[PDB]
Amino acid sequence: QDVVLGLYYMTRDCVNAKGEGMVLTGPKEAERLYRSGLASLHARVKVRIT
Amino acid sequence: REEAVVWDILDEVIREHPVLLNRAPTLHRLGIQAFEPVLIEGKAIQLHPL
Amino acid sequence: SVTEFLKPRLVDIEQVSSTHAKVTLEPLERGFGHTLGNALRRILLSSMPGCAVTEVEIDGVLHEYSTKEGVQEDILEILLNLKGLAVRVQGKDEVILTLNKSGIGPVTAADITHDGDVEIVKPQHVICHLTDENASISMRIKVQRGRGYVPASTGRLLVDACYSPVERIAYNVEAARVEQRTDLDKLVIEMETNGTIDPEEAIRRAATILAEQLEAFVD
Amino acid sequence: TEFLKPRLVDIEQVSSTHAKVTLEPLERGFGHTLGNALRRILLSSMPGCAVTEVEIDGVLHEYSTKEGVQEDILEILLNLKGLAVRVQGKDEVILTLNKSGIGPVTAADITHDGDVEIVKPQHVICHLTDENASISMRIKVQRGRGYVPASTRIHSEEDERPIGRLLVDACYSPVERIAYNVEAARVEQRTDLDKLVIEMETNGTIDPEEAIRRAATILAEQLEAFVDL
Amino acid sequence: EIKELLKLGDLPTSGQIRLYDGRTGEQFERPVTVGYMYMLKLNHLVDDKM
Amino acid sequence: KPLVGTGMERAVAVDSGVTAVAKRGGVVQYVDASRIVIKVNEDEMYPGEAGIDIYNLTKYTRSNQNTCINQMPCVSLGEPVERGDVLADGPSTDLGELAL
Numbered sequence: 001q002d003v004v005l006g007l008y009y010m011t012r013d014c015v016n017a018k019g020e021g022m023v024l025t026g027p028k029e030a031e032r033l034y035r036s037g038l039a040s041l042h043a044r045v046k047v048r049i050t
Numbered sequence: 051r052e053e054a055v056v057w058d059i060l061d062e063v064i065r066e067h068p069v070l071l072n073r074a075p076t077l078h079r080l081g082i083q084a085f086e087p088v089l090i091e092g093k094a095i096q097l098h099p100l
Numbered sequence: 101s102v103t104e105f106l107k108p109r110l111v112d113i114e115q116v117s118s119t120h121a122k123v124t125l126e127p128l129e130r131g132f133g134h135t136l137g138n139a140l141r142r143i144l145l146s147s148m149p150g151c152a153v154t155e156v157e158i159d160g161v162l163h164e165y166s167t168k169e170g171v172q173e174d175i176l177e178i179l180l181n182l183k184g185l186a187v188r189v190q191g192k193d194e195v196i197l198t199l200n201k202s203g204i205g206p207v208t209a210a211d212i213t214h215d216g217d218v219e220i221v222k223p224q225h226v227i228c229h230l231t232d233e234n235a236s237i238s239m240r241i242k243v244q245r246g247r248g249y250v251p252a253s254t255g256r257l258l259v260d261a262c263y264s265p266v267e268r269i270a271y272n273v274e275a276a277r278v279e280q281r282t283d284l285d286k287l288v289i290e291m292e293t294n295g296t297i298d299p300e301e302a303i304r305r306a307a308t309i310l311a312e313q314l315e316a317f318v319d
Numbered sequence: 320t321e322f323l324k325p326r327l328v329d330i331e332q333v334s335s336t337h338a339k340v341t342l343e344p345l346e347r348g349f350g351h352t353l354g355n356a357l358r359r360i361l362l363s364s365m366p367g368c369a370v371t372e373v374e375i376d377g378v379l380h381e382y383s384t385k386e387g388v389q390e391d392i393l394e395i396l397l398n399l400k401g402l403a404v405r406v407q408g409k410d411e412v413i414l415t416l417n418k419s420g421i422g423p424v425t426a427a428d429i430t431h432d433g434d435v436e437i438v439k440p441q442h443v444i445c446h447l448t449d450e451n452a453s454i455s456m457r458i459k460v461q462r463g464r465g466y467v468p469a470s471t472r473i474h475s476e477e478d479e480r481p482i483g484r485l486l487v488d489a490c491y492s493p494v495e496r497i498a499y500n501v502e503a504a505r506v507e508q509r510t511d512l513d514k515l516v517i518e519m520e521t522n523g524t525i526d527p528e529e530a531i532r533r534a535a536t537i538l539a540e541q542l543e544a545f546v547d548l
Numbered sequence: 549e550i551k552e553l554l555k556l557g558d559l560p561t562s563g564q565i566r567l568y569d570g571r572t573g574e575q576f577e578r579p580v581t582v583g584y585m586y587m588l589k590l591n592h593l594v595d596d597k598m
Numbered sequence: 599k600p601l602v603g604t605g606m607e608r609a610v611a612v613d614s615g616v617t618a619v620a621k622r623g624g625v626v627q628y629v630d631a632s633r634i635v636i637k638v639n640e641d642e643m644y645p646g647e648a649g650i651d652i653y654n655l656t657k658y659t660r661s662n663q664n665t666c667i668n669q670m671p672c673v674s675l676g677e678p679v680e681r682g683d684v685l686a687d688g689p690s691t692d693l694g695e696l697a698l
Contacts, residue, residue: 003099022252022260023176025184028268028292036146038251041577048180054279091282093598102366102462105537108544125544131363132541134571135356140545142352149320247320248347300548307545309322313349314542316326317535355573382658387630391657391670421675448629448675586600588698591663 010041017043024048061089071095105129106284113300119267120292121299126276133273133285140289141269143306146248148264150296151189153182154250155242156257164257171237172229181227183259185209186294187243188219194244199227202236212241221296265294266302322346325353325515327531335438335523336495340531343514344506350513354499357517360534364464367493367524368406370399371472372459373485381485387452390445392485398444400487402426403522404460407434411461416444419453429458438523463491493524599697607696614696616688618653618669623680629671632657634685642681655686665689 019039024030024047033039064087072082090096106129114122128136156179161168164175171178189195195218201207209225230237242256250261269291276286291299325342332338345353373396377385384391390398406412412435418428426442445454469486480486497519504514519527554561564579600607611617624638627650634653643649655669669686672693673679684694691697 019251023180025180029262031268032145032249033251035141036249038249048177057279089282093594102464105364105541107541110544110548123548128541129364131359135359135538136541136545138572139352139356142348146348147346303545304548307542310352311539311542311546312322313324313345313353314535314539316324317532318539319532319536351573355570358573359570384631384657386632389629389631389671389674391631391668394670584601586602591665 012042013044014040014042019043019045021045026050064089071097105132108287111286115300119295119299120290123289123291123300123303125287125289127278127284128276128287130283130285133287137271137273137287137289139310140303140306141271143310144266144269144291144302145264147309148266148302148306149245149247150263150265151187151243151245152261152263153185153187153241153259154194154244154246154261156182156259157240157242157255158257159238162255170230170232170235172231178228179257179259181225182241183262185225185227186221186262186265186296188221188296189243189245190217190219192217192245194242197241197243198238199241200236200238201227201230202234203230204233204235205230207237218243221294262294265297266299267292267294323512325349327528330528332526337518337520338527339516339518340527341514341516342531343504343512345501345513345515347511347513350499350501350515354501354515354517356538357531357534358497358499360537361494361497361519361530362492364537365492365494365525365530365533366462366464367491367522368404368460368462369489369491370402370458370487371411371461371489372480373399373456373487374459374483375454375456375485378485379483385454387447387449388445388454389448395445396485396487398442399458400490402442402444402458403438403493403524405436405438405524406460406462407436409434409462411459414458414460416454416456416458418447418455419451421447421450421452423447424454435460461489463489465492466490493522494530495520495522599692599695603695608694611688611691611694611696612682612684614688614691616667616669617684617691617694618655618686618688620679620681620683620685621651624651624678626673626675626677626679626685629673629675631655631671634671634673636679636685653685 017040019033020043022045024033024045026048030039030045030047034041039045066086068084069087070082070084076082088096106127108125108128111124111126112122114124116122125136158168158175158178161175164179167174173181195215197212197215197218199207199212201211206229207227208223209220209227210223212220214220228237244261246261246263248264250263252258252260269289271287271289273285273287275282276284278284289303291302293299293302297305323344323346325345328341328343330338330340342353375385375392375395378392381392381396388395412432414429414432414435416424416429418424423446424444425440426437426444427440429437447454466488468488472486473480497517500516500518501513502516503510504512506512517531519530521530551561554563562579563581563583565582566579567576567582568574569576612619618634620636622636622638622642624636626634627637628635632655634655636651636653638649638651640649655671656667658666658668661667667689669688671686673685679685687693
């Protein structure tokens with residue numbers, strides 16, 4: 001019950017959020033952004049996926 | 051005497067020895083399972099969430 | 101023993117690749133694992149200094165909204181890939197390099213104008229692919245030295261600057277024991293860098309900076 | 320690369336228990352880092368001096384009661400646990416508490432010593448409720464750090480303490496709550512220089528001018544490893 | 549009346565406060581409910597059952 | 599004490615028979631955490647009786663669940679009390695209000 005709440009909160013998306021619309025070179029960088037506080041978890045972004 | 055060396059002996063014995071855990075009642079076979087044990091200071095049995 | 105806190109001895113370097121390692125510290129006093137791990141993370145991830153590309157000027161294009169032909173990938177993708185480039189710049193604040201390429205084939209980082217003072221740590225870094233017989237590109241790439249990861253908050257084109265070489269650092273604390281207590285902390289630190297700086301030395305630098313900030317009070 | 324180093328520019332001792340201290344200048348992010356690291360260190364590792372054992376004249380066990388006292392022996396032990404004192408350059412000390420007559424029994428009744436200083440003399444231990452009532456106890460105070468319950472202590476003493484020696488749980492940590500607030504400072508006509516202000520509520524045994532320095536020393540000595548690679 | 553009483557103190561009328569994680573100094577996203585709940589120690593302690 | 603209650607404690611703790619209750623009004627004369635002696639005022643004093651009412655409080659005693667049920671005083675020497683007032687708090691009770 002608790003884990004699914006965390007995943008639901010992490011992958012949800014908001015309309016306007018901090019760090020919205022930029023381009024991320026890869027998932028790792030995305031994590032850095034969150035831990036540096038420059039971006040919100042629900043921000044909409046384009047990341048290069050493999 | 052609970053000698054400090056006896057705790058090393060226990061940490062060697064329990065290395066790869068499974069322990070069976072079962073809750074009462076056990077309606078289905080998934081209620082009894084084997085686990086690799088690890089020593090804990092307290093008196094409660096640490097169980098996994100999943 | 102009122103001033104005799106336990107000092108850990110590194111169990112291993114636990115290297116998994118030339119970029120990332122699994123530096124583990126053991127053992128630490130309860131509550132000291134996070135106090136050190138989070139501080140090291142907060143230093144490395146946002147305050148480490150380095151040289152990175154911050155501005156670009158591609159030939160005859162005003163903005164990445166315009167997708168010039170002759171290149172398989174679009175200008176936005178070109179900018180992100182150039183952001184992915186890791187550089188080692190010696191003794192300058194900002195530099196202007198020029199990359200020029202021609203012919204049917206990909207563009208690789210080995211083609212930049214090596215000044216000799218500038219070290220491109222990954223010559224094999226792919227830039228883009230040219231898609232015509234006469235397909236030729238030439239661009240002026242601006243590098244600058246700074247600290248941290250500066251976002252795009254600021255014929256030039258701005259790009260996010262990855263001054264800090266640490267691609268990713270993550271740490272965990274776990275239970276460790278001595279002959280009489282199981283409350284101590286073992287700190288497993290993992291870091292992956294861009295390759296300009298080896299991880300094992302990078303943390304060596306990080307604590308350094310932190311230690312400096314403590315100099316005025318420690319006796 | 321422009322990092323500046325912090326200096327304890329000012330300390331405001333607003334009370335005997337509550338104080339503030341500002342570290343300036345600090346670059347970006349260091350305010351959060353220093354604030355939280357030093358908060359954790361000060362909460363966890365700060366040594367203090369607390370009561371460790373008690374021995375009252377005519378009692379046998381903590382669950383008994385003394386004649387002519389309003390508080391049971393357990394409540395007396397709890398009140399003694401609340402006592403906070405200073406010691407000058409010693410690892411342990413034994414203080415005698417001699418009192419008689421109707422009225423309260425406050426910390427002032429303890430035989431004062433040149434090396435022993437009480438942060439709050441207005442601490443009440445118990446109330447005597449008879450004209451001839453009197454209690455004499457030999458309080459033992461020890462330095463240390465952290466919290467050491469009495470159950471752990473005796474099993475580590477490895478000797479049988481004599482009948483009549485009661486053991487209390489010592490909370491050596493003299494700080495109660497540490498908060499840090501980060502705010503900008505007008506330095507060098509440039510912004511993004513955080514002034515870290517730490518406000519601490521203590522028992523009054525230690526002065527922050529030494530508490531913050533000891534915390535920084537602990538942090539640096541622990542940090543020696545990561546630069547020793 | 550609960551809101552009115554909270555207004556008498558300097559406490560927030562929302563009932564929810566923002567907290568900071570002690571390990572990392574970060575602020576939890578969105579406020580959390582904090583108060584004084586009356587708790588009782590039930591007579592089922594583990595040392596009587598292990 | 600409970601911060602949020604329903605006011606029923608002021609009865610449940612009193613009628614439980616576990617707290618020492620002043621049989622008559624008067625002024626406290628001596629307390630030693632074992633025996634509280636009350637100088638019951640002459641308005642309710644029997645003409646020939648003592649005129650002074652003891653209360654031997656019960657100290658640590660085992661209960662049916664192996665718990666302690668000692669009663670501790672809450673009144674002060676010289677404090678006036680009226681018949682029905684709770685003199686000594688029992689287990690799980692404090693200042694006459696049930697507190698689990």
